[PDB]
Amino acid sequence: GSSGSSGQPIKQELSCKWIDEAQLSRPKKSCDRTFSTMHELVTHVTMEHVGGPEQNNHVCYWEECPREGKSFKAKYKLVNHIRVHTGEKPFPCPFPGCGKIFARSENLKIHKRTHTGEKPFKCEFEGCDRRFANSSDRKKHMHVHTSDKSGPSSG
Ligand SMILES: [Zn+2]
Ligand SMILES: [Zn+2]
Ligand SMILES: [Zn+2]
Ligand SMILES: [Zn+2]
């Protein structure tokens, strides 16, 4: 194998929500941890979770696993399953009521135009012209509104 790997890739954070049903501590707790790379999350979620090739009955209990904690007929079967628990992406969708995510930059940029011309979150400040997708940004654009400007009438 070989690749250009020009420059540095994208730094994405991962999380393995492991909710043990046999846990005697409530409310049900999840596996608190993080990783800088996928591989690191694999060796863990697999060994640090599903265990190694030594464990016979291996079962992955996800905070909301689609399997509901079911056993497989092979190791590769389980290890391959957790593959869905990763779902690593470069950048989500700038739309709130979309929660959509893509693995391509052109896909998102092209999919963002298929949403609408105007933004959902518009500056609440009257006589102001802005655009936002998250109530956070807007509320952050107010830090500059606290004050006013006296000069150009038509603004
Ligand atoms: Zn974990
Ligand atoms: Zn699972
Ligand atoms: Zn979208
Ligand atoms: Zn404004």
Curated annotation (Swiss-Prot):
Effect on the protein of changing residue 113 to A: Increases its cytoplasmic localization. Does not interact with KPNA1 and KPNA6 and increases strongly its cytoplasmic localization
Outcome (variant: residue 83 to A): Increases its cytoplasmic localization. Does not interact with KPNA1 and KPNA6 and increases strongly its cytoplasmic localization
Cross-link (Glycyl lysine isopeptide (Lys-Gly) (interchain with G-Cter in SUMO2)): 11
Effect of residue 75 to M: Increases its cytoplasmic localization
Short motif Nuclear localization signal, span: 60-85, 93-115
Result of altering residue 100 to A: Increases its cytoplasmic localization. Does not interact with KPNA1 and KPNA6 and increases strongly its cytoplasmic localization
Reported effect, residue 31 to S: Increases weakly its cytoplasmic localization
Effect of residue 44 to R: Increases its cytoplasmic localization
Record note on what altering residue 86 to M does: In HTX1; lacks DNA-binding; does not inhibit transcriptional activation and interaction with GLI3
Zinc finger (C2H2-type): 14-49, 58-85, 91-115, 121-145
Phenotype for residue 67 to M: Increases its cytoplasmic localization
Cellular location(s): Nucleus; Cytoplasm
Disorder named in the UniProt entry: Heterotaxy, visceral, 1, X-linked: A form of visceral heterotaxy, a complex disorder due to disruption of the normal left-right asymmetry of the thoracoabdominal organs. Visceral heterotaxy or situs ambiguus results in randomization of the placement of visceral organs, including the heart, lungs, liver, spleen, and stomach. The organs are oriented randomly with respect to the left-right axis and with respect to one another. It can be associated with a variety of congenital defects including cardiac malformations. VACTERL association X-linked with or without hydrocephalus: A syndrome characterized by a non-random association of congenital defects. Affected individuals manifest vertebral anomalies (V), anal atresia (A), cardiac malformations (C), tracheoesophageal fistula (TE), renal anomalies (R) such as urethral atresia with hydronephrosis, and limb anomalies (L) such as hexadactyly, humeral hypoplasia, radial aplasia, and proximally placed thumb. Some patients may have hydrocephalus. Some cases of VACTERL-H are associated with increased chromosome breakage and rearrangement.
Domain commentary: The C2H2-type 3, 4 and 5 zinc finger domains are necessary for transcription activation.
Family named by the database record: Belongs to the GLI C2H2-type zinc-finger protein family.
Complexes and interactors: Interacts (via the C2H2-type domains 3, 4 and 5) with MDFIC (via the C2H2-type domains 3, 4 and 5); the interaction reduces its transcriptional activity. Interacts with KPNA1 and KPNA6. Interacts (via C2H2-type domains 3, 4 and 5) with GLI3; the interaction enhances its transcriptional activity.
Protein function: Acts as a transcriptional activator. Required in the earliest stages in both axial midline development and left-right (LR) asymmetry specification. Binds to the minimal GLI-consensus sequence 5'-GGGTGGTC-3'.
Protein name (database record): Zinc finger protein ZIC 3
Native source species: Homo sapiens (Human)
Lineage: Eukaryota, Metazoa, Chordata, Craniata, Vertebrata
Residues of the full protein shown: 245 to 386 of 467
